CSV table of C-alpha atoms and ligand atoms in Angstrom, one decimal:
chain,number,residue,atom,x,y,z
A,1,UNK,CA,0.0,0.0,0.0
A,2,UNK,CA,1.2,3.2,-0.9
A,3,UNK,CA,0.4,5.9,1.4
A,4,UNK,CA,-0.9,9.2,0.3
A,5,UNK,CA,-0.1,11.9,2.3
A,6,UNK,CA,2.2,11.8,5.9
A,7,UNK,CA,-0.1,10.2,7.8
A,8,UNK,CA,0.4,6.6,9.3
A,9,UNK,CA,-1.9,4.3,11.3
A,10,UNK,CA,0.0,3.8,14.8
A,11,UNK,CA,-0.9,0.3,15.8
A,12,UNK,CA,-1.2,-1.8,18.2
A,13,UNK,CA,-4.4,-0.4,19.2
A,14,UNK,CA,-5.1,-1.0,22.9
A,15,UNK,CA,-8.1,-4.1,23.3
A,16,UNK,CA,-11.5,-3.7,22.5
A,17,UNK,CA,-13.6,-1.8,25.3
A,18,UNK,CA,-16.3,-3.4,26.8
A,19,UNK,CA,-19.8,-2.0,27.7
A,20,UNK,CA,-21.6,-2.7,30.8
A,21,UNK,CA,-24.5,-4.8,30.2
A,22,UNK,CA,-26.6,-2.4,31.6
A,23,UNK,CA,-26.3,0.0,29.0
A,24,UNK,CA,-29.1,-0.8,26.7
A,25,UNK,CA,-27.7,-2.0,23.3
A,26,UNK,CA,-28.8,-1.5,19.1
A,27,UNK,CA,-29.0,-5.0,17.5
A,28,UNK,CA,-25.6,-4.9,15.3
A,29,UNK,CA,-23.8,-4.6,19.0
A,30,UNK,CA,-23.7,-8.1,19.1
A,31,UNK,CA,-23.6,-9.3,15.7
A,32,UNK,CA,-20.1,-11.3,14.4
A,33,UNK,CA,-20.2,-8.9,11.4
A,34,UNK,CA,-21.5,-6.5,13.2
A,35,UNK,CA,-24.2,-6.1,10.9
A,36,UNK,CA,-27.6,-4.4,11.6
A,37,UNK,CA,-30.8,-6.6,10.6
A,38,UNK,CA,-33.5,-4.0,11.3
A,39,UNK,CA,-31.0,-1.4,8.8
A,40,UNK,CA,-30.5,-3.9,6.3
A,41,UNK,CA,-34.5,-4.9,6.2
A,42,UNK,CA,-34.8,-1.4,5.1
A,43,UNK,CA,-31.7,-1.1,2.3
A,44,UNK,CA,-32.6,0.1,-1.0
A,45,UNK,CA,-35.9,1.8,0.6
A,46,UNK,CA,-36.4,5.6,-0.3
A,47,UNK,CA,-39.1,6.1,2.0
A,48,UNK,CA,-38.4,8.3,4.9
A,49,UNK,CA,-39.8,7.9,8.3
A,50,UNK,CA,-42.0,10.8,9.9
A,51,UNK,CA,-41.1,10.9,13.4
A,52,UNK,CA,-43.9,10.5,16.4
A,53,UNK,CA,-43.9,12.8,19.3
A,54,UNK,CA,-42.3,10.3,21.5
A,55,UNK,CA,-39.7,9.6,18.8
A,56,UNK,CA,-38.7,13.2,19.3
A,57,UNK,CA,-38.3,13.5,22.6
A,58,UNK,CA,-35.9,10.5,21.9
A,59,UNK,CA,-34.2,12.3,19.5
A,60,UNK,CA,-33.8,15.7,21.4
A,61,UNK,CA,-32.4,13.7,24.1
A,62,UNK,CA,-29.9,11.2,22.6
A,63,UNK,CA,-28.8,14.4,20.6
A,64,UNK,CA,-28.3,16.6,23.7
A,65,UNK,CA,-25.8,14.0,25.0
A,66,UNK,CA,-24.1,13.6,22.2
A,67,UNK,CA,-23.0,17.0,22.1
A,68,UNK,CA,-22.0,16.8,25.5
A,69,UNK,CA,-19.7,13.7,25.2
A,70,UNK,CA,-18.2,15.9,21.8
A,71,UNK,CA,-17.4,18.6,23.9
A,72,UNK,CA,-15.4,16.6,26.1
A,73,UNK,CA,-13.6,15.3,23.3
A,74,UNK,CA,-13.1,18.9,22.4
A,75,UNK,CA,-11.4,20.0,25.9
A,76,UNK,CA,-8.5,16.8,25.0
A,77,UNK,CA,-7.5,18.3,21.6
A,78,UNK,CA,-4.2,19.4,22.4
A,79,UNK,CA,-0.5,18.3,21.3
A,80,UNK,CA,0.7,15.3,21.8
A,81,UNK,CA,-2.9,13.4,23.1
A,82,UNK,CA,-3.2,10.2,21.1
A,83,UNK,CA,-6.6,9.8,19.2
A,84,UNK,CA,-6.8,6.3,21.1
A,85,UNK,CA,-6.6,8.8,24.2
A,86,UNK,CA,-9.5,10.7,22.8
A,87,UNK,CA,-11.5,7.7,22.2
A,88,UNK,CA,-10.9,6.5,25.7
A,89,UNK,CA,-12.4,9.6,27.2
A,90,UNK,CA,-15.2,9.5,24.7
A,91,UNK,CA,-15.8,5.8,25.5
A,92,UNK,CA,-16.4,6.7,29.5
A,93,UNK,CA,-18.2,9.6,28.5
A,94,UNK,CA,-21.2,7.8,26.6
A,95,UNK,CA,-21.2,5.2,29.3
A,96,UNK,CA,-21.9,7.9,32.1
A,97,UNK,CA,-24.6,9.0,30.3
A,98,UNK,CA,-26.1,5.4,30.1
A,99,UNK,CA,-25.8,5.6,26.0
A,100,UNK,CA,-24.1,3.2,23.8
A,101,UNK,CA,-21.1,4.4,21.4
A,102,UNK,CA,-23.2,3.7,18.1
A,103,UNK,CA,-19.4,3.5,15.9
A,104,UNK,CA,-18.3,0.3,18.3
A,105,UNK,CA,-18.4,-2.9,16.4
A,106,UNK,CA,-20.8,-1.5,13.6
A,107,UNK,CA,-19.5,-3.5,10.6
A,108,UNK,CA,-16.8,-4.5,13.1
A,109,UNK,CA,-15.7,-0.6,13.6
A,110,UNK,CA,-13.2,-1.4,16.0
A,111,UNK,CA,-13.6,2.0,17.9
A,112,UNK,CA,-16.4,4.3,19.7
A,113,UNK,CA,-15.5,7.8,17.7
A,114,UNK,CA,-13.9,8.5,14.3
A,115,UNK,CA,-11.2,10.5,14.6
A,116,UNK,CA,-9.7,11.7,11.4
A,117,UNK,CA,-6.4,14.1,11.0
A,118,UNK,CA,-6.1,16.1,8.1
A,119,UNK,CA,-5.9,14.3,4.6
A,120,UNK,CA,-8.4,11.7,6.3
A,121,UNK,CA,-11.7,12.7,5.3
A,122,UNK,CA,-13.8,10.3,7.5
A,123,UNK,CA,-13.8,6.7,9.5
A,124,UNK,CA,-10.2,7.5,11.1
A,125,UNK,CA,-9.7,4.4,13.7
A,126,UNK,CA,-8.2,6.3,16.7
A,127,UNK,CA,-4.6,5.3,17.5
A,128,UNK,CA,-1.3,6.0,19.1
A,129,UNK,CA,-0.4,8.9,17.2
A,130,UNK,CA,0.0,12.0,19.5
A,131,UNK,CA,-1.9,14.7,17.8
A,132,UNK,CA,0.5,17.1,16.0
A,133,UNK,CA,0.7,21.2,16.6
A,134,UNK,CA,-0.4,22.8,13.1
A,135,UNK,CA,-3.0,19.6,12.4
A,136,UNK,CA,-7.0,19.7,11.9
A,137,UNK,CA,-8.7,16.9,13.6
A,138,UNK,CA,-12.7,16.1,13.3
A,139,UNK,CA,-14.5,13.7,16.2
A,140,UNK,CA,-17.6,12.2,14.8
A,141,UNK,CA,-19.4,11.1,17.5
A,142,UNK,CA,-22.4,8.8,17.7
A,143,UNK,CA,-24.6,7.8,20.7
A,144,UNK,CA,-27.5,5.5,20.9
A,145,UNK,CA,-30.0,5.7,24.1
A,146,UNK,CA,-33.5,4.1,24.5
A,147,UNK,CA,-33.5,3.2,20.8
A,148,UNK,CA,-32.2,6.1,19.2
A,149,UNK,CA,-28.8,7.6,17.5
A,150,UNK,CA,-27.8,10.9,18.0
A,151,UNK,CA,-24.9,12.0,15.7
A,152,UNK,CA,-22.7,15.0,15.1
A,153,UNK,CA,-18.8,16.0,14.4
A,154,UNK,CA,-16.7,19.3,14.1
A,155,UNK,CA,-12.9,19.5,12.7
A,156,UNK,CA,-10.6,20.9,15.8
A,157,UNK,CA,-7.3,22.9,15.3
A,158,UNK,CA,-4.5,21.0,17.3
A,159,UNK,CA,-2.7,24.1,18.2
A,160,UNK,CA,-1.5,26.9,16.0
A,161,UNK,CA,-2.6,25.9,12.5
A,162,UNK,CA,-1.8,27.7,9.2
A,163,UNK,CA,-4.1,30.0,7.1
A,164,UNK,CA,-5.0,27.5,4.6
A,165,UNK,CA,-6.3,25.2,7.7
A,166,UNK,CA,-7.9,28.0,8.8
A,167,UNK,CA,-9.9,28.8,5.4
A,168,UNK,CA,-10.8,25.0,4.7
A,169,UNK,CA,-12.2,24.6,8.3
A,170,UNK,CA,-14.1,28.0,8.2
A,171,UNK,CA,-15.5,27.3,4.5
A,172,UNK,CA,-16.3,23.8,5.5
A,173,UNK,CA,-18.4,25.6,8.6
A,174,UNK,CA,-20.4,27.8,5.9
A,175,UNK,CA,-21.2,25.3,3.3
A,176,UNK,CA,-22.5,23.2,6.7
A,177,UNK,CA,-24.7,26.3,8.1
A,178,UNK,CA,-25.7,27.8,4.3
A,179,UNK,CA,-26.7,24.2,3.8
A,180,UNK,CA,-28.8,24.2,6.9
A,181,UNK,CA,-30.1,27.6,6.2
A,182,UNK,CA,-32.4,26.0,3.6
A,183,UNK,CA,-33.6,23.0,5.3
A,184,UNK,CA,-37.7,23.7,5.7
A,185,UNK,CA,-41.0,21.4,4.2
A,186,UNK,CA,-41.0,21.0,0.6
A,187,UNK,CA,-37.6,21.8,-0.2
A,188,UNK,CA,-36.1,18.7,-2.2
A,189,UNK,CA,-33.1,17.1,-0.3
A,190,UNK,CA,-31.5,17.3,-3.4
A,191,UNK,CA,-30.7,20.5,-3.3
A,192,UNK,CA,-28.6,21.3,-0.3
A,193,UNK,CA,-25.6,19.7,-2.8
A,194,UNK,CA,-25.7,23.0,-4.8
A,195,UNK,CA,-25.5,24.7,-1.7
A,196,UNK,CA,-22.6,23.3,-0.6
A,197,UNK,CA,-20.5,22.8,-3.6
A,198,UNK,CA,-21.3,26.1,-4.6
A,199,UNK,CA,-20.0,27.6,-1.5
A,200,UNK,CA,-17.0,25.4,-1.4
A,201,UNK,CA,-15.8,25.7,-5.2
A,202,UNK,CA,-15.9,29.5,-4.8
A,203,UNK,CA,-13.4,29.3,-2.4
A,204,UNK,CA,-10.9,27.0,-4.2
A,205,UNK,CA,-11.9,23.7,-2.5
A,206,UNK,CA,-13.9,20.0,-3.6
A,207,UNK,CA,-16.6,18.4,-2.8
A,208,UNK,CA,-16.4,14.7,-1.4
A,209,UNK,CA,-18.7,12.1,-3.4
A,210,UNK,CA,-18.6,8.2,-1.8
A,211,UNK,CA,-19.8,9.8,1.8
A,212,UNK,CA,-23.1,11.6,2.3
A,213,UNK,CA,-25.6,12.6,5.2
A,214,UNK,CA,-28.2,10.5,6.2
A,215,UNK,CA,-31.4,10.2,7.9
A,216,UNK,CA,-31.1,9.1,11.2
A,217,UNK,CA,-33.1,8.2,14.0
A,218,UNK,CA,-34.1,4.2,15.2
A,219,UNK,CA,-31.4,3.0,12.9
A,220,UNK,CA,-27.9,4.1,12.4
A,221,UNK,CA,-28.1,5.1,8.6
A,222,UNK,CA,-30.9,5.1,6.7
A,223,UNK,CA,-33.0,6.9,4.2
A,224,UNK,CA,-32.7,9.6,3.0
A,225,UNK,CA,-29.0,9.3,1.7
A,226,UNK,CA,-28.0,12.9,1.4
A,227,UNK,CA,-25.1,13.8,-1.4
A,228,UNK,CA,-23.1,17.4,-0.4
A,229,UNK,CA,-22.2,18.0,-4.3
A,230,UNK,CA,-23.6,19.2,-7.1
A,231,UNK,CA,-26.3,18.1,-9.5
A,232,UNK,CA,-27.5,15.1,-7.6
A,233,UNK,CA,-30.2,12.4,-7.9
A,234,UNK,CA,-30.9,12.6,-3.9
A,235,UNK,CA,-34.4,10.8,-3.6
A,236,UNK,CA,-37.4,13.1,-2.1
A,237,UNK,CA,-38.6,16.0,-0.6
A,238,UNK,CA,-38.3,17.4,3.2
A,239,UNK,CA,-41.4,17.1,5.2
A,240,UNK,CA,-41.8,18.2,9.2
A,241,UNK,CA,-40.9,15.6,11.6
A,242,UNK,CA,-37.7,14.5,9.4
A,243,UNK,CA,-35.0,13.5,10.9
A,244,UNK,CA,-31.2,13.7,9.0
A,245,UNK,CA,-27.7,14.4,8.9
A,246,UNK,CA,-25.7,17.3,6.7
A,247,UNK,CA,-22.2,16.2,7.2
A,248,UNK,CA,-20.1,18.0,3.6
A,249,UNK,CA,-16.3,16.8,4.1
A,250,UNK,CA,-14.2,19.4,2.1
A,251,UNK,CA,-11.0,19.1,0.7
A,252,UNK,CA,-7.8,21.5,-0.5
A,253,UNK,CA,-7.2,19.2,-3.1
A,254,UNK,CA,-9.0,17.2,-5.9
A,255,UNK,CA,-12.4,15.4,-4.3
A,256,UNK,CA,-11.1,11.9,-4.9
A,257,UNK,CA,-11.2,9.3,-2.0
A,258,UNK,CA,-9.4,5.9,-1.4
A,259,UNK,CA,-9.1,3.4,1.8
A,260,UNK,CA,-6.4,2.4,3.5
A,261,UNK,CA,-5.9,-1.4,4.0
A,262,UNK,CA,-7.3,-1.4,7.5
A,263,UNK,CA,-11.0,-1.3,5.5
A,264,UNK,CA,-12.4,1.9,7.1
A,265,UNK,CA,-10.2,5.0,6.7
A,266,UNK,CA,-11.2,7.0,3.8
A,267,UNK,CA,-8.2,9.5,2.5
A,268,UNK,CA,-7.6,12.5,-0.2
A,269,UNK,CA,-5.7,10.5,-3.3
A,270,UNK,CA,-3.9,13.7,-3.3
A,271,UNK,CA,-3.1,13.5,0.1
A,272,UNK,CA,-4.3,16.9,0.8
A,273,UNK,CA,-6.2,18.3,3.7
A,274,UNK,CA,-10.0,17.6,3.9
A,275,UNK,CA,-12.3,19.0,7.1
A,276,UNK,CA,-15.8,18.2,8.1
A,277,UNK,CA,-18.9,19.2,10.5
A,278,UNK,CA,-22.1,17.4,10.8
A,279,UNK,CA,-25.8,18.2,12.7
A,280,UNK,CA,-28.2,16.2,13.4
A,281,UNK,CA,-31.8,18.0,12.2
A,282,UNK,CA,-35.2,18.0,12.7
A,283,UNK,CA,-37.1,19.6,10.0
A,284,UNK,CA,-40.4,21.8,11.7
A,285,UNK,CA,-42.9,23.8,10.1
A,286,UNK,CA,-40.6,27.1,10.2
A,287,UNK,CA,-37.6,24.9,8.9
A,288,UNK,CA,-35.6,23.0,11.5
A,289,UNK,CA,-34.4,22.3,14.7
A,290,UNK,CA,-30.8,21.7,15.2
A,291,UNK,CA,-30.8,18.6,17.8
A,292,UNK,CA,-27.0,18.4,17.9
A,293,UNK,CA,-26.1,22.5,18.6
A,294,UNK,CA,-24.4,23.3,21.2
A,295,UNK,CA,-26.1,24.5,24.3
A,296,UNK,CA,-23.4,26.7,25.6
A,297,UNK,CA,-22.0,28.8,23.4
A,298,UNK,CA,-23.1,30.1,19.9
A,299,UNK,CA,-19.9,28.8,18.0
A,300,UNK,CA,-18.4,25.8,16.9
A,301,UNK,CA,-14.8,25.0,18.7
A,302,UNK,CA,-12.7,26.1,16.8
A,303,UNK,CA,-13.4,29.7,16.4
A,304,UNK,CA,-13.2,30.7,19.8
B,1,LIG,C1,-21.9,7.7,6.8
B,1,LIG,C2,-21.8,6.3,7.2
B,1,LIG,N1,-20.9,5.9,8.2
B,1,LIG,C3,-20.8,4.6,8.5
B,1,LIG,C4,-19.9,4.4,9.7
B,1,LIG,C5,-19.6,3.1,10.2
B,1,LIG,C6,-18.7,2.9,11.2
B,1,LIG,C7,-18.1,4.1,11.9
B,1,LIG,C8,-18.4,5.4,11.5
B,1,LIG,N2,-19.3,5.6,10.3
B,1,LIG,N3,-21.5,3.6,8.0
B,1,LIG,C9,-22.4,4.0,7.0
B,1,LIG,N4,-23.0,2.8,6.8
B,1,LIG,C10,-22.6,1.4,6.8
B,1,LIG,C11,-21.9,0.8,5.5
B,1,LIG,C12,-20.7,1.6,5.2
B,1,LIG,C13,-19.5,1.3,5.9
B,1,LIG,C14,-18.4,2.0,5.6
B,1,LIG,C15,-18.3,3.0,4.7
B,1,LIG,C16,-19.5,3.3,4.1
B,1,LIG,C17,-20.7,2.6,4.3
B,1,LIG,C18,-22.6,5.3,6.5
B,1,LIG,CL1,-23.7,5.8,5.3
B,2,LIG,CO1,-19.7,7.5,9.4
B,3,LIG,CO1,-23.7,11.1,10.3
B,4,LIG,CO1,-21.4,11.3,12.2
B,5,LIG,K1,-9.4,15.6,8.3
């Protein structure tokens, strides 16, 4: 395998972390492959489920502490923690709460958080590598409480970073906010793509294509499938009590993406930087709720 960009996978990773039985588990948490039967029941489906009023109150829950486990993560990002450090933390975190980590063992996802330094785009496995001053790092984070997944991410400067950091993970931001901007009934989900590419091509940056957003709510991933580029085929229209992800990963470079041998993390070809965010969204009849914001402050990490 011929590497890309710098970055290296730092093995061994330390064993497997367990969960209490008590925390109430989805049904892939126990599957050899890992594999989710009530997701997979539902693949190839474009029909989108309309949320009840108790399915909500799920939601808003499972969301609020997902946030707060992803601003733990966020008080670790400093030089020289390892991502398998980060991970750790995170691990403890969703276990105080009584939530599962959704990313453990789903399709065999050896971790509880994706952690994924610069030219890795998404599904970094965290590791022994201490985190570096000058790079970007995004935690996606994923909980699952009382039947329900609550998911969000942001990109983190480790340290002083340089300006074209600084652009990609501010652009990235905007295409993320612009795109939410729009969210409302009976806009086609479609759409958001030109939002996003739009804002990230005028600023000199691409437009992943193999990863998209995704509704979210009893399952992990499921419909609708939600493209961040261009001209896309993205199958129906937004209708109140919706529940999905807008999650764009941007990149300095071309948009291409390959995988490393260890099966899950997804690289630039180029080797360049790429940067993500991600919110979990309810659409209402005004437009949407943002289950995933954070509660404390009216800004993301890392500006401030
Ligand atoms: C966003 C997204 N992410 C994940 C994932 C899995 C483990 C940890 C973090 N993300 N799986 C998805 N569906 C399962 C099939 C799959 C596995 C790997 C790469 C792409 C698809 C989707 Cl849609
Ligand atoms: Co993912
Ligand atoms: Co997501
Ligand atoms: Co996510
Ligand atoms: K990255």
């Amino acid at each position: 395998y011929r590497y890309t960009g710098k970055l290296r996978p730092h093995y061994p990773l330390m064993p497997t972390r367990p969960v209490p039985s008590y925390i109430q588990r989805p049904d892939y948490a126990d599957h050899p492959l890992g594999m989710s039967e009530s997701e997979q029941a539902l693949k190839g489906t474009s029909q989108i489920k309309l949320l009840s009023s108790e399915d909500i109150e799920g939601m808003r829950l499972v969301c609020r502490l997902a946030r707060e486990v992803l601003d733990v993560a966020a008080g670790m990002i400093k030089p020289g923690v390892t991502t398998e450090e980060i991970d750790h933390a995170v691990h403890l975190a969703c276990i105080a709460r009584n939530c599962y980590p959704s990313p453990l063992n789903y399709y065999n996802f050896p971790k509880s958080c994706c952690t994924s330094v610069n030219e890795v785009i998404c599904h970094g496995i965290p590791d022994r590598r201490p985190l570096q001053e000058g790079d970007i790092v995004n935690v996606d984070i994923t909980l699952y409480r009382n039947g329900y997944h609550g998911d969000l991410n942001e990109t983190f400067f480790v340290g002083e970073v340089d300006d074209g950091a600084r652009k990609l993970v501010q652009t990235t931001y905007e295409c993320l906010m612009q795109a939410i901007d729009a969210v409302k009934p009976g806009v086609r989900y479609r759409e958001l793509g030109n939002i996003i590419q739009k804002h990230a091509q005028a600023n000199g940056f691409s437009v992943v294509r193999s990863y998209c957003g995704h509704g979210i709510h009893k399952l992990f991933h499921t419909a609708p499938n939600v493209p961040h580029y261009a001209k896309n085929k993205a199958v129906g229209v937004m209708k109140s009590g919706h529940v999905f992800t807008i999650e764009p990963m941007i990149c300095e470079g071309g948009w291409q993406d390959e995988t490393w041998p260890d099966g899950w993390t997804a690289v630039t070809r180029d080797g360049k930087r790429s940067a993500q965010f991600e919110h979990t969204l309810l659409v209402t009849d005004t437009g949407c709720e943002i289950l995933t914001r954070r509660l404390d402050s009216a800004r993301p990490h890392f500006m401030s």
